[PDB]
Amino acid sequence: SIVAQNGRLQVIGTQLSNEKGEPVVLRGASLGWHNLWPRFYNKNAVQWLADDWKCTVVRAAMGLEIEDNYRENPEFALQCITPVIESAIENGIYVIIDFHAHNKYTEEAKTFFAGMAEKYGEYPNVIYEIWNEPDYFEWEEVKTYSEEVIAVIRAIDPDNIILVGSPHWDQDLHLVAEDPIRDVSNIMYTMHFYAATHEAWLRDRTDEAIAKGIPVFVSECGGSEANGDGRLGIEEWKTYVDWMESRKISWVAWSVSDKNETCSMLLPRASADGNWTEDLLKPWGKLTRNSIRNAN
Ligand SMILES: [Mg+2]
């Protein structure tokens, strides 16, 4: 397994790396908002993503927005993410624990990540993603949130990777480049793209940030348009994946879900437990599976 092969991850300059310092590129898939598609938050779905899709990473999107989220129902949130985290340990793959927020929830994030850090911080599998997609904020406000949450995490878990979001749905890496978080190790900054909407500028902005010493991890992306629906930009998806592979940027495709939207990879008929035959994969599902399998 990838976790057996690589152990504890670390960030050297900009490059996500293994215990021995060799570059690591993780490729995998994100479950959708747990409060929308909770049926896929189970051990078998995760093992199936590991075995059949060849995911080296799985992302657990713990919804902080929309009905039945973590604030309104934290027991259910913890019922969903726990088997996904455990199963990633069991099957030897990395797992992103994603505080899937748009708004700023500083105190909830600290309490949640402290508990996650205590439970799971010794496992090399675990990556923290502290704020999915900050929308309408200045970078300074998101940096403060991030410094404060990182401070809490690091006190318990000194070494595991922490992924840091930025404003405008993790598009403002140029603001991060000008004012990065200092005196902190093993963090990376997230970038999210949707290939049918976001044109070449975002890749150029990301490259510019990497050049100024900003590590970049794509914790969410897709071939659909930015709303999760509309056109499947197949050529644009290839352009982005090829660009990421030449930059050794890790990536996670969105979403393992069954809504009637382009970005939902599965038909509703699909089992919660996996064994998705080709007919149960949506076009974006097939493209994601193939993308991940050929890269890994
Ligand atoms: Mg640790």
Residue numbers in the entry: 11 to 306
Sentences from the paper on this structure:
Surprisingly, the Cel5R shows halotolerance and extreme halostability in 4 M NaCl, 3 M LiCl and 2 M KCl which is higher than other known halostable cellulases.
To understand the molecular mechanism of Cel5R, its crystal structure was determined by molecular replacement method at 2.2 Å resolution. The crystal belonged to P212121 space group, and consists of two Cel5R molecules in an asymmetric unit. The results of PISA33 server did not indicate any stable interaction at the protein-protein interface, thus eliminating the possible existence of Cel5R as dimer in solution. The overall structure of Cel5R was similar to other members of the GH5 family, and consists of (β/α)8 – barrel fold, commonly known as the TIM barrel. Along with canonical TIM barrel fold, the structure had two extra β-strands running antiparallel to each other at the N-terminus. The superposition of Cel5R with other cellulases indicated that the residues Glu143 and Glu230 were likely to be two critical residues, where Glu143 acts as a proton donor while Glu230 acts as a nucleophile. In Cel5R the distance between Glu143 and Glu230 was found to be 6.2 Å suggesting it may follow retaining mechanism. In Cel5R, the subsites −2 and −1 were occupied by glycerol molecules. The crystal structure analysis indicates that the free cysteines in Cel5R are involved in hydrogen bond interaction with the neighboring residues that are participating in catalysis (interactions between Cys65 with Leu59, Cys90 with Phe86, Cys231 with Val262 and Csy273 with Gly238, Glu271). The crystal structure analysis also reveals that the halophilic nature shown by Cel5R may be due to acidic residues (16.7% with 52 residues) present on the surface of the protein.
